[PDB]
Design a binder for this molecule. Structure first.
Ligand SMILES: [Mg+2]
Ligand SMILES: [Mg+2]
Ligand SMILES: [Mg+2]
Length: 70
RNA sequence: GAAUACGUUCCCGGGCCUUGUACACACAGCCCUCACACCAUGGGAGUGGGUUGCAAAAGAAGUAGGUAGCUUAACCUUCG
């Protein structure tokens, strides 16, 4: 829900955060219409101690910490 | 200068006693946080032999056996 403040500046591109807890991702992904969260943002599951492959521009690391160095 | 506690179940404080205790300066006891180094142990792709076992092949020296080639002083010579 950082989008209200990410777009307060004008980030409007594809923000897609990847968690693993599906009982938490689906307890927060239903919000798309229930809460009427902005319609310009996707979310998809994924880890990073296993899957850091792709290309993007900004790489938000919030709960990475040293769990990958664990 | 006088209207006059019917009553002690109640941590100003102590005695008698009991069970414990996560107790001995001596009373109370259920994590929120992490890459965690570095010496010791249990492992552990492959390397390598020791010592070699096993299926064999090949066999140096020596010892023994055979042996039509070859060679030779003692013996017998029939004297070839
Ligand atoms: Mg007392
Ligand atoms: Mg041997
Ligand atoms: Mg010989």
């Amino acid at each position: 829900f950082s989008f209200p403040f990410f777009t307060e500046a004008g980030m409007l591109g594809q923000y897609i955060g990847f968690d693993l807890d599906k009982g938490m991702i689906e307890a927060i992904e239903h919000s798309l219409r229930t809460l009427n969260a902005p319609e310009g943002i996707v979310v998809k599951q994924g880890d990073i101690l296993s899957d850091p492959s792709g290309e993007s521009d900004l790489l938000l690391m919030f709960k990475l910490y040293t769990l990958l160095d664990r």
